[PDB]
Amino acid sequence: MSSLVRRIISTAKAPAAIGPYSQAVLVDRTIYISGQLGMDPASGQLVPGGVVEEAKQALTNIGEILKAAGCDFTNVVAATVLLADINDFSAVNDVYKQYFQSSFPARAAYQVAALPKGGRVEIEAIAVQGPLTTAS
Amino acid sequence: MSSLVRRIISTAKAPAAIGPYSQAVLVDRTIYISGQLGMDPASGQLVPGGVVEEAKQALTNIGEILKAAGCDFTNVVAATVLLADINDFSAVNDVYKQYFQSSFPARAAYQVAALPKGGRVEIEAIAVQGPLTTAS
Amino acid sequence: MSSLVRRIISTAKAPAAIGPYSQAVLVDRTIYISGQLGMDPASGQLVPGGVVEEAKQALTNIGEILKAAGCDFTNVVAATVLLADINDFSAVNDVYKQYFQSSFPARAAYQVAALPKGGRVEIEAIAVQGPLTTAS
Amino acid sequence: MSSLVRRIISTAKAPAAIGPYSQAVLVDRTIYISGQLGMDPASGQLVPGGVVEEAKQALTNIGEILKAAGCDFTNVVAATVLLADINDFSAVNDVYKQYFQSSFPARAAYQVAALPKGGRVEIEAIAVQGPLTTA
Amino acid sequence: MSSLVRRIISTAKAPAAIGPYSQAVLVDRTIYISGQLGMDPASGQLVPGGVVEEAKQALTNIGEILKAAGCDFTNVVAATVLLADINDFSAVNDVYKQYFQSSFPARAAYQVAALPKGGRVEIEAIAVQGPLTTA
Amino acid sequence: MSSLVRRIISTAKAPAAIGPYSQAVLVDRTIYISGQLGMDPASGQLVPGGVVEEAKQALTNIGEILKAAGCDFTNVVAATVLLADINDFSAVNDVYKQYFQSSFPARAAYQVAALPKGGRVEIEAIAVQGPLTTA
Numbered sequence: 001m002s003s004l005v006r007r008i009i010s011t012a013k014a015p016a017a018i019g020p021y022s023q024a025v026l027v028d029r030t031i032y033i034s035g036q037l038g039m040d041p042a043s044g045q046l047v048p049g050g051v052v053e054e055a056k057q058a059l060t061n062i063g064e065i066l067k068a069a070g071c072d073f074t075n076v077v078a079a080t081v082l083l084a085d086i087n088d089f090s091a092v093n094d095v096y097k098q099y100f101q102s103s104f105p106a107r108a109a110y111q112v113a114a115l116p117k118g119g120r121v122e123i124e125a126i127a128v129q130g131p132l133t134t135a136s
Numbered sequence: 137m138s139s140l141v142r143r144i145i146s147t148a149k150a151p152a153a154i155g156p157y158s159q160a161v162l163v164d165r166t167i168y169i170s171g172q173l174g175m176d177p178a179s180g181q182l183v184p185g186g187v188v189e190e191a192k193q194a195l196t197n198i199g200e201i202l203k204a205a206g207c208d209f210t211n212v213v214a215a216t217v218l219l220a221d222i223n224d225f226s227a228v229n230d231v232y233k234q235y236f237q238s239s240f241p242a243r244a245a246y247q248v249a250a251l252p253k254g255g256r257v258e259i260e261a262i263a264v265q266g267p268l269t270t271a272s
Numbered sequence: 273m274s275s276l277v278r279r280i281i282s283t284a285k286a287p288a289a290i291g292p293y294s295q296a297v298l299v300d301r302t303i304y305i306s307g308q309l310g311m312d313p314a315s316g317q318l319v320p321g322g323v324v325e326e327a328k329q330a331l332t333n334i335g336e337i338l339k340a341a342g343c344d345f346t347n348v349v350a351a352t353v354l355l356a357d358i359n360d361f362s363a364v365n366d367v368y369k370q371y372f373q374s375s376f377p378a379r380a381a382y383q384v385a386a387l388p389k390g391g392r393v394e395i396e397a398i399a400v401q402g403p404l405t406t407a408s
Numbered sequence: 409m410s411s412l413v414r415r416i417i418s419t420a421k422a423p424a425a426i427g428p429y430s431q432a433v434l435v436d437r438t439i440y441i442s443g444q445l446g447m448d449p450a451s452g453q454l455v456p457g458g459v460v461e462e463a464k465q466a467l468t469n470i471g472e473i474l475k476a477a478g479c480d481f482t483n484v485v486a487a488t489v490l491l492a493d494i495n496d497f498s499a500v501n502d503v504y505k506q507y508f509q510s511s512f513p514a515r516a517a518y519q520v521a522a523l524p525k526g527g528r529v530e531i532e533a534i535a536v537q538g539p540l541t542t543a
Numbered sequence: 544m545s546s547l548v549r550r551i552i553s554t555a556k557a558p559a560a561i562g563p564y565s566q567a568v569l570v571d572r573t574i575y576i577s578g579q580l581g582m583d584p585a586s587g588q589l590v591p592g593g594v595v596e597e598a599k600q601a602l603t604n605i606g607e608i609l610k611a612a613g614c615d616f617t618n619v620v621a622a623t624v625l626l627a628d629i630n631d632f633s634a635v636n637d638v639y640k641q642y643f644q645s646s647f648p649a650r651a652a653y654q655v656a657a658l659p660k661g662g663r664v665e666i667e668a669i670a671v672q673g674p675l676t677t678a
Numbered sequence: 679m680s681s682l683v684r685r686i687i688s689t690a691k692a693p694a695a696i697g698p699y700s701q702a703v704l705v706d707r708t709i710y711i712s713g714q715l716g717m718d719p720a721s722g723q724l725v726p727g728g729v730v731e732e733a734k735q736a737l738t739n740i741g742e743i744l745k746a747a748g749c750d751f752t753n754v755v756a757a758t759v760l761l762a763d764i765n766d767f768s769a770v771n772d773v774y775k776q777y778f779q780s781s782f783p784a785r786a787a788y789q790v791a792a793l794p795k796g797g798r799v800e801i802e803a804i805a806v807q808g809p810l811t812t813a
């Protein structure tokens with residue numbers, strides 16, 4: 001059988017993945033991105049200001065991991081939005097909509113019991129390395 | 137590198153995906169389907185009657201998104217069943233078993249803190265566009 | 273279009289998947305593995321001793337499903353660690369790190385409201401059938 | 409391993425087989441096209457007029473086989489031009505150029521000792537089913 | 544990019560190489576088979592009896608190369624029949640038909656000026672490793 | 679279906695086209711290389727010295743086309759050696775061996791009636807872009 005490419009993604013522009021995981025793994029053409037919190041890459045802790053500020057930082061973190069893999073937000077095909085409070089969905093969704101223009105990823109959003117670091121939002125994503133011919 | 141196909145799936149037979157997400161995204165041969173609640177496509181709200189009725193509607197919604205992608209339930213390879221109450225697993229599983237006959241998807245099922253719309257069940261799925269040669 | 277391979281994975285060395293799901297599904301080159309609890313394959317119930325003992329059993333279960341698919345832990349590309357208590361993350365992570373040496377999977381870890389069987393940890397994984405050429 | 413598509417291409421718009429071969433075989437996305445003489449599709453006989461008329465008919469036949477496989481001449485990636493007479497090279501090149509207007513295929517062209525039915529030219533091709541990317 | 548499988552196919556059931564070539568090369572799923580003369584595998588000499596016997600032996604040799612690559616004649620998608628004498632066309636066609644019983648490959652068949660060792664026929668082939676889909 | 683890469687390979691390090699063909703076509707990962715005569719790349723004329731010198735130049739030209747496509751001779755999977763004179767077989771084999779040092783391609787080699795420009799040898803090839811796996 002063919003030997004498929006696997007690339008470990010690492011960038012200093014996003015919180016370091018310490019311990020036995022990677023920021024993202026590209027395998028064949030699919031990139032599995034680890035869930036990102038609203039963590040500042042240089043502080044090792046949550047940015048202040050609550051769920052809206054954390055959502056902006058989380059998506060900035062995802063964007064920097066995508067860039068390191070040669071992609072941008074147009075390559076995302078599926079995402080999961082995990083919340084500490086379901087009532088924060090609308091506010092987080094108003095941040096999320098700023099990162100996508102069309103051909104939107106599949107998505108699930110729901111409230112979990114707790115996230116690491118006391119986070120109020122965590123975003124996971126799957127992307128596919130381009131080029132991609134988008135039909136509809 | 138080759139340009140892989142990406143298709144955005146949209147059908148009126150399932151609740152519309154309003155905002156920055158799609159009902160499903162087909163990319164290469166893999167379809168990522170957004171989590172479906174027991175929402176009536178024409179009412180914009182949960183069907184009445186509780187978790188069993190919602191589970192039937194959620195799976196009907198998934199079925200209509202699959203059809204729009206040229207698939208049926210035999211193309212599903214992985215699913216996630218999210219519950220408002222773990223004790224509803226058996227009742228939801230008795231609905232779920234009606235949609236699959238053999239070569240069953242991988243699955244995870246667990247209780248979350250809250251789903252959108254006050255839902256009691258949400259189902260996510262991954263499918264692969266056929267033809268598929270099923271070995272075992 | 274080409275007919276892609278789908279294989280249903282079943283091994284007696286891991287808890288049987290009773291009902292309408294499979295331990296894992298291999299489709300093309302990607303293996304979707306059902307979430308595994310710290311369940312003893314021969315008892316049908318959780319191993320005693322708490323979250324650390326359950327985490328060891330869960331990962332042993334994943335390992336036996338991988339073996340049945342012709343893989344080992346080096347083929348895992350993404351994993352999810354679901355917890356009954358976020359404060360158990362460090363203890364579970366000290367077990368998890370024993371199964372991986374390098375080129376670590378993408379990962380998400382968080383606390384859910386409840387797992388089946390009263391479990392304190394559940395691990396889901398995605399693997400890709402080898403050979404894999406790991407770049408970095 | 410996956411099961412790859414293999415399809416026999418057959419159209420009555422190209423000449424019937426005069427031996428144990430298919431007009432073309434599509435396998436995965438590559439189409440191997442049998443050598444075409446300048447035979448009229450309805451009668452199976454070589455068209456009159458010599459190498460120029462036979463070359464036009466052979467390429468017309470290839471075109472109908474490509475069309476049956478959902479392709480046109482832009483899908484051809486390689487071709488072989490077998491001549492009964494190397495002095496016909498310039499004449500056949502001028503015919504050939506009119507069918508392959510862009511993304512010219514790779515090619516080999518030379519004289520053999522004899523072609524079936526006394527043909528003056530026979531043309532083989534390899535195509536790849538689209539879509540293909542552009543420069 | 545992915546690393547594609549490339550394997551040299553070699554079997555003692557087919558004649559040893561008399562030059563700098565492999566019996567066949569498998570790359571991804573396509574198998575390019577070298578031109579086969581009607582040589583006996585054990586001795587490397589052309590079998591007696593002329594074009595009919597040489598054609599049978601050449602096709603038998605192709606069959607053993609296919610078998611070594613996990614294939615049979617149904618995996619062949621394209622072939623080339625090189626003749627020393629175009630008048631042998633009907634005789635070679637009748638031999639060839641007995642090996643290719645279904646899904647007939649694409650083909651080109653014609654006379655060249657000379658084959659190695661004075662062979663009267665040489666046959667090349669391209670195959671695709673299965674599984675392949677059916678009509 | 680996916681859009682497969684198709685690229686015309688063209689380098690001034692190999693001779694300019696003297697007809698309606700590209701030096702090579704890359705499609706997906708397979709490279710079809712046009713027949714190369716022993717023509718000098720700068721002048722387009724056959725090198726003096728007969729079949730041995732022409733064979734070296736033809737293979738040098740193939741090498742430059744492979745290099746333009748990010749390949750070398752180890753990527754070649756199949757080749758065809760067309761001779762004006764079958765008695766040159768041993769001489770051409772000795773030249774050919776010096777370029778293909780490992781993983782020898784599949785091959786067909788025989789005499790045709792005439793080559794363009796009065797060439798004594800013409801060589802075609804098929805390559806697959808790497809990476810390829812090893813034994």
Ligand code: NA
Nearest residue numbers: 107108109157
């Ligand atoms: Na959503």
Ligand code: NA
Nearest residue numbers: 050084085120
């Ligand atoms: Na809070």
Ligand code: NA
Nearest residue numbers: 243244245293
């Ligand atoms: Na389950």
Ligand code: NA
Nearest residue numbers: 186220221256
């Ligand atoms: Na309720």
Ligand code: NA
Nearest residue numbers: 021379380381
């Ligand atoms: Na993690």
Ligand code: NA
Nearest residue numbers: 322356357392
């Ligand atoms: Na507990």
